């Protein structure tokens, strides 16, 4: 009943990203961002706290703080699986200014609920602290996310970091013998030649959404993960995007049925994006955390901390054998 909040947040953030640049590729991990902001909210009070929690789309008349954090705690317990079949890991860390004493409640909550690692860092040497954090993220993403942090202010007091790593095989993998170059239309007029993978005579969950002018198909991974592909009719992408809502996802899930598909063609591709999320989070109602009125006194006991920036980077690689994706989020907290 709380996955709907995370889906609400995912789609609300997506729409803001697309409004600013409607023709760019998009890749991000909403779960990484949600977890990082919930982690941060362990130290928040009053308006700063309620804005973060409502910004994450939780209903505070129906859910307690404890229930929210427990839902992230439970999620983290499952998102740590490992076999050649499917690798999925997620980790949280706090980089703490040297000599800065944290509240017992904050430290204990972070360890218990987010499984966080902690590192004392001298933020006065911003290049060293940057290297430290970027290497931590590089290790957690198995080399896939490098340079998460492009700059750090020397007045930084704490950085909260979340990373996610995903490597999976298709339940029905494509055979590269049947991958051939054909056209992908960027627009009705502009096309590019790309390797199109193909599958034949396949039975998969399928739904033609005539009302929303799009086709939905589900391609499973080996393991507890799936890929949902949504193909809007030409020129309908912007309206399909507006229909991205938890109820739409639920309706798609209820409407998928096994169907025999004669031919399916999917391109190989590898995309990457990085973001500064300050403006979008402000659009979602997270405001006081970024200002001199921030109330993050639940971290050290002093109300002298504000969020300077929230940054995110993510990569997606799709190919015949499976998919590799990873992302990381950093919440930079500076001294007031």
């Amino acid at each position: 009943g709380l996955a709907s909040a995370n889906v609400d947040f995912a789609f609300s953030l997506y729409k803001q990203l697309v409004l600013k640049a409607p023709d760019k590729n998009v890749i991000f991990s909403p779960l990484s961002i949600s977890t990082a902001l919930a982690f941060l909210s362990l130290g928040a009070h009053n308006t700063t706290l309620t804005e973060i929690l409502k910004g994450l789309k939780f209903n505070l008349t129906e859910t307690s703080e404890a229930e929210i954090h427990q839902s992230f705690q439970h999620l983290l317990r499952t998102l740590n699986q490992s076999s050649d079949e499917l690798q999925l890991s997620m980790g949280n860390a706090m980089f703490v200014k040297e000599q800065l004493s944290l509240l017992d409640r904050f430290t204990e909550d972070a360890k218990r609920l987010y499984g966080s690692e902690a590192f004392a860092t001298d933020f006065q040497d911003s290049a060293a602290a940057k290297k430290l954090i970027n290497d931590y993220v590089k290790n957690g993403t198995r080399g896939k996310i490098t340079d998460l942090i492009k700059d750090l202010d020397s007045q930084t007091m704490m950085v909260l970091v979340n990373y996610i790593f995903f490597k999976a095989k298709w339940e029905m993998p494509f055979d590269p013998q049947d991958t051939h170059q054909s056209r992908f239309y960027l627009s009705k007029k502009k096309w590019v030649m790309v390797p199109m993978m193909s599958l034949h005579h396949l039975t998969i969950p399928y739904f033609r959404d005539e009302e929303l002018s799009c086709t939905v198909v589900q391609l499973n991974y080996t393991g507890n993960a799936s890929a949902l592909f949504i193909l809007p009719d030409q020129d309908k992408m912007e309206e399909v995007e507006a229909m991205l809502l938890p109820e739409t996802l639920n309706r798609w899930g209820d409407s998928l049925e096994f169907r025999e598909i004669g031919e399916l063609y999917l391109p190989k591709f590898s995309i990457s994006r990085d973001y500064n999320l300050n403006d979008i989070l402000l659009q979602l109602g997270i405001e006081e955390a970024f200002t001199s009125k921030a109330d993050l006194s639940g971290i050290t006991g002093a109300r002298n901390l504000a969020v300077s920036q929230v940054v995110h980077k993510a990569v997606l690689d799709v190919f015949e054998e499976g998919t590799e994706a990873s992302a990381a989020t950093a919440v930079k907290i500076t001294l007031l």
Binding site: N6, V7, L75, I164, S182, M196, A227, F229, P232, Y265
Partner: protein, 37 residues
Amino acid sequence: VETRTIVRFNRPFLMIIVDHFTWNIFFMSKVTNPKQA
């Protein structure tokens, strides 16, 4: 006349990587231009 189904991802599309049980979203993406590795 037979009925058949063909799916061609040859224009911008969405890809959502989800947990099997909760359908929590691990990754959200839109491919407007399929760049190569």
